[PDB]
Write a protein that binds this ligand. Sequence first.
Ligand SMILES: *Cc1cc2c(cc1C)nc1c(=O)[nH]c(=O)nc-1n2C[C@H](O)[C@H](O)[C@H](O)COP(=O)(O)OP(=O)(O)OC[C@H]1O[C@@H](n2cnc3c(N)ncnc32)[C@H](O)[C@@H]1O
Ligand SMILES: [Cl-]
Length: 498
Amino acid sequence: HEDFLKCLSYTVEPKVIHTSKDSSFFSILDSSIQNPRFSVSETPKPVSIITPVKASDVQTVIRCAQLHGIHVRTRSAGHCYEGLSYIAYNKPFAVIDLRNLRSISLDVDNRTGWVQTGATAGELYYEIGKTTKSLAFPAGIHPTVGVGGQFSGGGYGTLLRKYGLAADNIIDALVVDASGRILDRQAMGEDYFWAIRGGGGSSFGVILSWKVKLVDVPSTITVFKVQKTSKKEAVRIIKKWQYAADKVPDDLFIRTTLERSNKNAVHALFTGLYIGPVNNLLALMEEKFPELGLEKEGCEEMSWIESVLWFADFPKGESLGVLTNRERTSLSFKGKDDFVQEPIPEAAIQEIWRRLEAPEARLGKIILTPFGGKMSEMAEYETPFPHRGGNLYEIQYVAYWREEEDKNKTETDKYLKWVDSVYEFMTPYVSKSPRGAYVNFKDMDLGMYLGKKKTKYEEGKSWGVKYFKNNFERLVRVKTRVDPTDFFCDEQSIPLVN
Ligand SMILES: *Cc1cc2c(cc1C)nc1c(=O)[nH]c(=O)nc-1n2C[C@H](O)[C@H](O)[C@H](O)COP(=O)(O)OP(=O)(O)OC[C@H]1O[C@@H](n2cnc3c(N)ncnc32)[C@H](O)[C@@H]1O
Ligand SMILES: [Cl-]
């Protein structure tokens, strides 16, 4: 690692290379940890962090690492559910933090833009929304999530039924491969270009930039919220949502969240985004979902960019500038998810409601996100993300807790157990053989490389088919061509072929 450091100085700037002796080290590392439970002293620390400022720096890191046997991890904005962008287990590593490469240059008239991978979804949103009210981009709702990790793993949000995933809307890209070669879509090839758009970027290289396709939105859209605190009534409505939500027009997004209310009781929160006017939303909802009981008072017409702040839980009429904040979260979490292919029984709905009444589920959520629309229109093979037609909705079980509590691992166990238990309960009701999982919600509990099988291929196949289903074999083929040394690897990365 010593020579490695020297190798970097042979130009890669001195003051973008951090090690433990640098006063500005634990701060650089701690800054973009967006799951605080993985910021504890007992978790593995890197022996160096590099914050590149030009592409050439990244190249040098890739080339020098391989030359001196140094393992790396790449961080954009650090929302990895298991912290695998700044944690490597059982072998010393360094971190390529992309915080300095976040330049966003749009071409609003040609509906494209280049987005450097250090940028957050919020920054991208801000750049678009401040410039034009008639364009958008389909990514997640949480502004501090980086485009690096999110886009390379798929990326859904309130426009998925209309426009699909973020990865479904990328038309070129720059990646540094195991050589240190900077490759655009033309230079990298279609197989490479495919793999990086959902396959999990940590398996394929260092993605430097995305070329996005901007999508059209009306200057006026409509959001709505309906709250149901009565279990009986809410369970009734959720049953109906299960049949309606994935079949409504592409313009209508209806999410169901089960969680605590301010009055410390379980409720069902139905929130949505309609790509059109309020009267059209209302007529559509009495037709397809009159059980929700939506009325004008539950609705609000605003711009799409304003709907971003809305879904991101900011005060109404807040300045768009909050999209640009990259502040550290204070809530640790454990998340798992599932895909539902046919409506779960009323009995299932009541039980998962019941489990949220648990004391340790006070900051927990069960979130039901409707697919259908563009999501069933697109075929499995089109991008590595496999969960298309046949999936009614995706469901995430996530428990949050205050980072203070992390001081006693034994105490935060109850949250893990909570999340594990509801997931186990849901087994008979969700997809099976394989049980589908979303790679942007990384879960070591589905399996990791430890030495269970002879080769990495047979061991990695285990969780591989859960994340990627029938797309797993292609990813492995692409992986074998583009990265035959297997330089880019973590605890769940795509394996080389046998
Ligand atoms: C933190 C979070 C995440 C999240 C969410 C809510 C919160 C609080 N809700 C989501 C949702 O509603 N919909 C959705 O699609 N995703 C949601 N997530 C998950 C989030 O998208 C993923 O965690 C995403 O992968 C995180 O991306 P980010 O860039 O912020 O995180 P990272 O730790 O730095 O990276 C994660 C993995 O990707 C690799 N990576 C990152 N950058 C690159 C580049 N440029 N090249 C190659 N690989 C890259 C990391 O190595 C890591 O494995
Ligand atoms: Cl998100």
